[PDB]
Amino acid sequence: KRQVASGRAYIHASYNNTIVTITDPDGNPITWSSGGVIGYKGSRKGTPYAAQLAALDAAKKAMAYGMQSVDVIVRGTGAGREQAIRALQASGLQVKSIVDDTPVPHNGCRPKKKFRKAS
Amino acid sequence: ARRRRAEVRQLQPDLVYGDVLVTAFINKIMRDGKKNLAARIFYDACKIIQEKTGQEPLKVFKQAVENVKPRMEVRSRRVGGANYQVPMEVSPRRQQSLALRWLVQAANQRPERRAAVRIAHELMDAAEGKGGAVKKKEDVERMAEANRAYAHYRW
Amino acid sequence: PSRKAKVKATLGEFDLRDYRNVEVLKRFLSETGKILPRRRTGLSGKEQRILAKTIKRARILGLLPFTEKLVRK
RNA sequence: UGGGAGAGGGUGGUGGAAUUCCCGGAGUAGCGGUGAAAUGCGCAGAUACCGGGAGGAACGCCGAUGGCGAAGGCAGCCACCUGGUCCACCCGUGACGCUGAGGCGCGAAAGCGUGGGGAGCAAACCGGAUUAGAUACCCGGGUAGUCCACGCCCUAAACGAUGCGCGCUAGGUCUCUGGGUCUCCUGGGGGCCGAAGCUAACGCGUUAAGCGCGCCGCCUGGGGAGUACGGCCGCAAGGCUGAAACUCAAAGGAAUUGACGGGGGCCCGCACAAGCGGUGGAGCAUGUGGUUUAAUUCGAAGCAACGCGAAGAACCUUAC
Ligand SMILES: [K+]
Ligand SMILES: [K+]
Ligand SMILES: [K+]
Ligand SMILES: [K+]
Ligand SMILES: [Mg+2]
Ligand SMILES: [Mg+2]
Ligand SMILES: [Mg+2]
Ligand SMILES: [Mg+2]
Ligand SMILES: [Mg+2]
Ligand SMILES: [Mg+2]
Ligand SMILES: [Mg+2]
Ligand SMILES: [Mg+2]
Ligand SMILES: [Mg+2]
Ligand SMILES: [Mg+2]
Ligand SMILES: [Mg+2]
Ligand SMILES: [Mg+2]
Ligand SMILES: [Mg+2]
Ligand SMILES: [Mg+2]
Ligand SMILES: [Mg+2]
Ligand SMILES: [Mg+2]
Ligand SMILES: [Mg+2]
Ligand SMILES: [Mg+2]
Ligand SMILES: [Mg+2]
Ligand SMILES: [Mg+2]
Ligand SMILES: [Mg+2]
Ligand SMILES: [Mg+2]
Ligand SMILES: [Mg+2]
Ligand SMILES: [Mg+2]
Ligand SMILES: [Mg+2]
Ligand SMILES: [Mg+2]
Ligand SMILES: [Mg+2]
Ligand SMILES: [Mg+2]
Ligand SMILES: [Mg+2]
Ligand SMILES: [Mg+2]
Ligand SMILES: [Mg+2]
Ligand SMILES: [Mg+2]
Ligand SMILES: [Mg+2]
Ligand SMILES: [Mg+2]
Ligand SMILES: [Mg+2]
Ligand SMILES: [Mg+2]
Ligand SMILES: [Mg+2]
Ligand SMILES: [Mg+2]
Ligand SMILES: [Mg+2]
Ligand SMILES: [Mg+2]
Ligand SMILES: [Mg+2]
Ligand SMILES: [Mg+2]
Ligand SMILES: [Mg+2]
Ligand SMILES: [Mg+2]
Ligand SMILES: [Mg+2]
Ligand SMILES: [Mg+2]
Ligand SMILES: [Mg+2]
Ligand SMILES: [Mg+2]
Ligand SMILES: [Mg+2]
Ligand SMILES: [Mg+2]
Ligand SMILES: [Mg+2]
Ligand SMILES: [Mg+2]
Ligand SMILES: [Mg+2]
Ligand SMILES: [Mg+2]
Ligand SMILES: [Mg+2]
Ligand SMILES: [Mg+2]
């Protein structure tokens, strides 16, 4: 609708969902999808297939905006990360590159109990 | 089968089409080891197909089988409390076993009074792309993938 | 395995306390701002301990990075 | 005197990563969470993404199997103030030493007082699930507290559960830090395996749990009990000290052979799975339980009792 051509694809993988966001060359989102955006409602969202689908939903909706080439950026380490990547590559969009940018503190905040017991 | 890998036993070729695949179908038809009666039934069927069809029954038989073979199916597997229908490929060996089994089952579900008619008509509707057999095959494949979400539990 | 070559053998006579020689210091950081382990640096308990001090100093100055993005996956 | 290594301590600065919140942008319907869910958050536009700001707390990689400290403990980086300690020279004093009741000081976490500060986390607590219940485990919230300053408290599995000092008694191997004529010798630490020896074993073994001397502390069967009383200390919570009546024949340590595990690794069996045909449904036959009976003879009782003893009950048999 605005014609952007080339941009960024952000994969936010986690153990509960995969949410993809495509943005213009400088971070502003164009479209987005996720296990919830598509059918899946609960546990299924995490699954890699859902990731695959969301990834495709994202690209498809992005090509409408005239997208063609993307720069992928992966954040997260969920059960479905690597699938969204293979999804975008076969989506039609050209994967110019892949980069893992998962945030990691240099030891800041006391984690939730669920994420402790970690020496 | 905890030790070996129980090898598939070979069957004696057909006394007519000299086909092993035929003896097989005959075995499924057979009940109470009445292999004669089984044989007759199948043959009168190849005959009834010769009738309503100007094609060699052996070719119809094959085609039919082929259409009823499921190339995918769901298998249950317990993981984390609940059981999940995991779809997975279906070995050639089992496809054959499944196709023939269903043909006879579907055929005996039919309305025609005579056994031979049933196998005949089922065999035809089969090579055509219809019939209760082909449905089972389809209801199965539809079942698979309909659970593709769990395809990562390869099994 | 850790056998690509040790960063020490791959260098020449250099001052481990020179926090400005980003030219060489940089060769001690991974494909990320991360300080390489002795198995890779080829340095010693004492040498390695001084490097750290130096690197961190360069990081404060802006000459060296604290972290970088992995390029693949 | 000359040097050395160090998260040893105190003070003041300062850095980047992340979380939360706030502002702007862009974007749209879900996010989050679980075994599965719901509570919860989101069209007053959340989640995901970019930019800006605020604030508190902690310090990734290097980190080790490492280093420092009397113990408790101590991890960005920089400066200052300061403790301990190791080595070389063989220079000075001339037994000035060791231990150490009481005293004094230090003393993790939680907790207390006064005043600050609160990002994240989180006793209580408020809810959602689970469950037979679930005042729990899992999930969404959340106050004290966690952080700082001053005072307090003085406890711990404060552990090497091993008091301090000195002398003596094979060696191998890895490691940290000095010195050397830098194969490798030397000194001080940290580990492992082991001579002799020691030990109930397990194990310890120049970093003794060996062989010895010095001094301190402490034990004397279990329960009652770290309780009661008393004293001292404390704002409090409580701390230190610490019994008795009554009662038991044990309480314990190490190791052995087993059995067991919702421990691990291998591996079998119609064990499951894959199949094909059946039985719990009908009528009937037969055994049984239960009722009933003058008697319904007796035994068999999960598997491994139930068409079983009975491979022949009308009288006989049968014991009723
Ligand atoms: K909703
Ligand atoms: K012994
Ligand atoms: K008292
Ligand atoms: K024991
Ligand atoms: Mg989910
Ligand atoms: Mg220090
Ligand atoms: Mg920040
Ligand atoms: Mg905003
Ligand atoms: Mg909330
Ligand atoms: Mg709402
Ligand atoms: Mg609502
Ligand atoms: Mg609206
Ligand atoms: Mg931001
Ligand atoms: Mg604030
Ligand atoms: Mg030490
Ligand atoms: Mg300790
Ligand atoms: Mg000093
Ligand atoms: Mg002298
Ligand atoms: Mg003299
Ligand atoms: Mg003393
Ligand atoms: Mg004295
Ligand atoms: Mg204290
Ligand atoms: Mg405290
Ligand atoms: Mg307070
Ligand atoms: Mg306060
Ligand atoms: Mg919380
Ligand atoms: Mg229960
Ligand atoms: Mg309840
Ligand atoms: Mg909670
Ligand atoms: Mg300990
Ligand atoms: Mg040694
Ligand atoms: Mg030593
Ligand atoms: Mg040594
Ligand atoms: Mg011995
Ligand atoms: Mg013993
Ligand atoms: Mg022994
Ligand atoms: Mg030893
Ligand atoms: Mg000794
Ligand atoms: Mg001893
Ligand atoms: Mg003592
Ligand atoms: Mg005592
Ligand atoms: Mg007593
Ligand atoms: Mg007692
Ligand atoms: Mg007490
Ligand atoms: Mg008092
Ligand atoms: Mg008082
Ligand atoms: Mg107490
Ligand atoms: Mg007594
Ligand atoms: Mg023993
Ligand atoms: Mg035993
Ligand atoms: Mg066992
Ligand atoms: Mg077997
Ligand atoms: Mg067998
Ligand atoms: Mg079975
Ligand atoms: Mg019945
Ligand atoms: Mg009755
Ligand atoms: Mg008797
Ligand atoms: Mg009886
Ligand atoms: Mg029997
Ligand atoms: Mg009689």
| First-to-last C-alpha distance (Å) of chain A | 52
Strands (E) located in chain C: none
Give phi and psi for B33, each to the nearest 5: 55, 25
Discontinuities in chain C with C to N beyond 2.5 Å fall right after none
- Note down the domain range covering C62: 1-73
Q: Which residues of B touch A50 (CB under 8 A)?
A: 149
Pick from B56, B153, B139, B137: nearest CA to B96: B137
Token reading at A115: 């994420």
Domain count, chain A: 1
DSSP single-letter state for residue B126: H
Query: Which positions ≥6 away from B66 have C-beta within 8 Å?
Result: B99, B127
Element (H, E) at B87: strand B83-89
Count other C-beta atoms under 10 Å from residue C45's C-beta.
Answer: 7
Cα separation, C24 vs C14, whole angstroms:
8
Q: Which nucleotides of D are covered by protein (CB under 7 A)?
A: 5-7, 14-19, 25-38, 47-51, 56-64, 66, 76-78, 119-122, 138-140, 175-178, 267-273, 275-277
Experimental determination approach used: X-ray
| First-to-last C-alpha distance (Å) of chain B | 18
Give phi and psi for B75, each to the nearest 5: -130, 130
Answer whether A4's CB lies under 8 Å from A30's CB.
Answer: yes
By the CB < 8 Å criterion, does A95 face chain C? Answer: no
Cα separation, C71 vs C73, whole angstroms:
7
CATH of the domain at A1: 3.30.420.80
A82 to chain C: closest CA residue: C73
- B1-155 CATH pick, 1.10.455.10, 1.10.357.10, 1.10.3720.10, 1.10.540.10: 1.10.455.10
Cα separation, B143 vs A86, whole angstroms:
25
Token reading at A32: 């987005």
Pick from A97, A90, A93: nearest CA to A5: A93
CATH of the domain at C44: 4.10.640.10
Partners of A71 in the β-ladder: A8, A97
Token reading at A88: 């975008």
Domain count, chain C: 1
Answer whether A51's CB lies under 8 Å from A36's CB.
Answer: no
Please state whether strand D lies within 7 Å of residue C53 at its CB atom: yes
In terms of Cβ atoms closer than 10 Å to its own Cβ (0-12, 13-18, 19+), residue B134 is: buried
Reduced 3-state DSSP string for A50-110: HHHHHHHHHHHHHHHCCCCEEEEEEEECCCCHHHHHHHHHHHCCEEEEEEECCCCCCCCCC
Answer whether B72's CB lies under 8 Å from B87's CB.
Answer: yes
In terms of Cβ atoms closer than 10 Å to its own Cβ (0-12, 13-18, 19+), residue B85 is: middle
Count other C-beta atoms under 10 Å from residue C71's C-beta.
Answer: 11
Query: Which positions ≥6 away from A37 have C-beta within 8 Å?
Result: A19, A54, A57
Count other C-beta atoms under 10 Å from residue C51's C-beta.
Answer: 21
Output the CA–CA distances (angstroms, integers) from residue B122 to A78, B25, B37, B47, B136, in the order listed: 49, 13, 19, 14, 13
Question: Strand D: which residues 60-119 of A lie within 7 A (CB)?
Answer: 75, 103-114
By the CB < 8 Å criterion, does A97 face chain C? Answer: yes
Cα separation, B91 vs B69, whole angstroms:
10
Q: A residues 65-104 near B, CB within 8 Å?
A: none
Cα separation, B9 vs A100, whole angstroms:
54
Longest dimension (CA), chain C: 37
- Note down the domain range covering A73: 1-119
Inter-chain contact B151–A49, Cβ cutoff 8 Å?
yes
3-class SS of residue B118: helix
CA torsion C54-C58-C61-C67 (nearest 10°) is -130
Query: Which positions ≥6 away from C53 have C-beta within 8 Å?
Result: none
Cα separation, B15 vs B17, whole angstroms:
6
3-class SS of residue C35: strand
Answer whether B19's CB lies under 8 Å from B13's CB.
Answer: yes
Inter-chain contact A100–C72, Cβ cutoff 8 Å?
yes
Inter-chain contact A99–C69, Cβ cutoff 8 Å?
yes
Query: Which positions ≥6 away from A7 have C-beta within 8 Å?
Result: A22, A23, A24, A25, A30, A62, A67, A69, A70, A71
3-class SS of residue A35: coil
CA angle B18, B22, B27 (to 5 degrees): 125
Cα separation, B90 vs B94, whole angstroms:
7
Instruction: Please tell me which residue lies nearest to nucleotide D25, judged from CA to C1'.
Output: A28
By the CB < 8 Å criterion, does A44 face chain B? Answer: yes
B148 to chain A: closest CA residue: A49
B146 to chain A: closest CA residue: A49
Element (H, E) at B135: helix B131-143
